[PDB]
Ligand binder design. Structure first.
Ligand SMILES: [Cl-]
Ligand SMILES: [Cl-]
Lengths: 210, 221
């Protein structure tokens, strides 16, 4: 739909840009790009409309712009309160609203931490119950955004994939999990499966085989 | 200023109707420049605009949901509402109401939102978990071992290890909801690789809604 990066981050006082890439139908279609800030559990708020207009009530540190099929939100002096999920939206000439998939903007308050990734194959006991579940557990990462991709013999798997949103641990790092639901027969019917975890532009991968 | 506040059922069963309500507070003032909208957001997924109702009560619905929805307004209650028919588990989401606006500089933006109301769709009422071991299979000398707590409803489940004596390196992960409308989660603990012969590790899973407790010992395989 609209393409945003899943994560962006900066230290207090720094500035950060978040891109939103559409087509010429929407962004570049016209100047109807808007941006929204969402703190968990609170009403989303409009922070930019018609691409570059900042509503009264919105901190002057937010500015929008666009160039191609790509629009951008810049946050200037990053303040703790700026930590939130941000979405772009556009009207489309097809008479509809399209959204991006969101970007978590973290205002760094501790060192970045790479996820510890563990991949478990189905247990023999689960196989006896006519079920197979691959279990990819991802913990102690910061900022609290990750991308998971599943692979069966190097090929991308979509179906059966169930992935959690990251949740904050008591040490203020994050944990998440991803499951791949299979049948015993498809479990044995492949050479190997991989769980690939992308964090901060760095990809780590675990692999299991029946 | 104006605030939007959603009300919902929390849980609905498949094949039933989902009815949500949005009350508008703080001055309102009915105007043909405002469009009262619904938008939903999927479990870690993207946003979907559902439809709106504007002015004299004309509606416009997203073509993919058009056949299942009615959006209506009850102005004497300062509210507007969404009925979504024959829901399935795929309709699980946080549902937001929003005010769209046509005014200059704000065109085609949603300038006020409600906080969202979580809606879960599932046929289950109480079902206890099946517990399967995640057998230990590094640079730091540790191995991860866990338990998979599968196919239960409703939330929550708690997990400790060794009756709560083992807390170090223990992480209990948030649940996923399956297309079955049943939850699964995992718990993991990181322990010394050298102790895998001499040490007993048992996950204690408690699901109070179904009054079930399960103790599962997790061994090397
Ligand atoms: Cl900078
Ligand atoms: Cl691969």
């Amino acid at each position: 739909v609209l393409t945003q990066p899943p994560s962006a981050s900066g230290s207090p006082g720094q500035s950060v840009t978040i891109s939103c890439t559409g087509t010429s139908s929407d962004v570049g279609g016209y100047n109807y790009v808007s941006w929204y800030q969402h703190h968990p559990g609170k009403a989303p708020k409009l922070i930019i409309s018609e691409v570059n207009n900042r509503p009264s009530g919105v901190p002057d540190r937010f500015s929008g712009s666009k160039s191609g099929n790509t629009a951008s939100l810049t946050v200037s002096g990053l303040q703790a309160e700026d930590e939130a999920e941000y979405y772009c939206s556009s009207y489309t000439d097809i008479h509809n609203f399209v959204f991006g998939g969101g970007t978590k903007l973290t205002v760094l308050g501790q060192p970045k931490a790479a996820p510890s990734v563990t991949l478990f194959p189905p247990s023999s006991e689960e196989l006896q119950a006519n079920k197979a579940t691959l279990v990819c557990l991802i913990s102690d990462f910061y900022p609290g955004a990750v991308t998971v991709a599943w692979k069966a013999d190097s090929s991308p798997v979509k179906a059966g994939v169930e992935t959690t949103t990251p949740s904050k641990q008591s040490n203020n790092k994050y944990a998440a999990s991803s499951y791949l639901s299979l049948t015993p027969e498809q479990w044995k019917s492949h050479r190997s499966y991989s769980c690939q975890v992308t964090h901060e532009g760095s990809t780590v991968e675990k692999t299991v085989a029946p | 200023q104006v605030q939007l506040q959603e009300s919902g059922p929390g849980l609905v069963k498949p094949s039933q109707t989902l009815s949500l309500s949005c009350t508008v507070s703080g001055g309102s003032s009915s105007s043909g420049a405002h469009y009262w909208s619904w938008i939903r957001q999927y479990p870690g997924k993207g946003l979907e605009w559902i439809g709106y109702i504007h002015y004299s009560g004309n509606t416009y619905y997203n073509p993919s949901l058009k056949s299942r929805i009615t959006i209506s307004q009850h102005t004497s209650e300062n509210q507007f509402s969404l009925k979504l028919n024959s829901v399935t588990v795929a309709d699980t989401a946080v549902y937001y109401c929003a005010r769209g606006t046509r005014l200059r500089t704000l065109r085609n933006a949603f300038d006020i939102w409600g906080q969202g109301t979580m809606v879960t769709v599932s046929s289950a009422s109480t079902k206890g978990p099946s517990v399967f071991p995640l057998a230990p299979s590094t640079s730091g000398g540790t191995a991860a071992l866990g338990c998979l707590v599968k196919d239960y409803f409703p939330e929550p489940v708690t997990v400790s290890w060794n009756s709560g004596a083992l807390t170090s390196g223990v992480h209990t992960f948030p649940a996923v909801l399956q297309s079955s409308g049943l939850y699964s989660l995992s718990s993991v603990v990181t322990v010394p690789s050298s102790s895998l012969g001499t040490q007993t590790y048992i996950c204690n899973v408690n699901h109070k809604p179904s009054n079930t407790k399960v103790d599962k010992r997790v061994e090397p395989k």
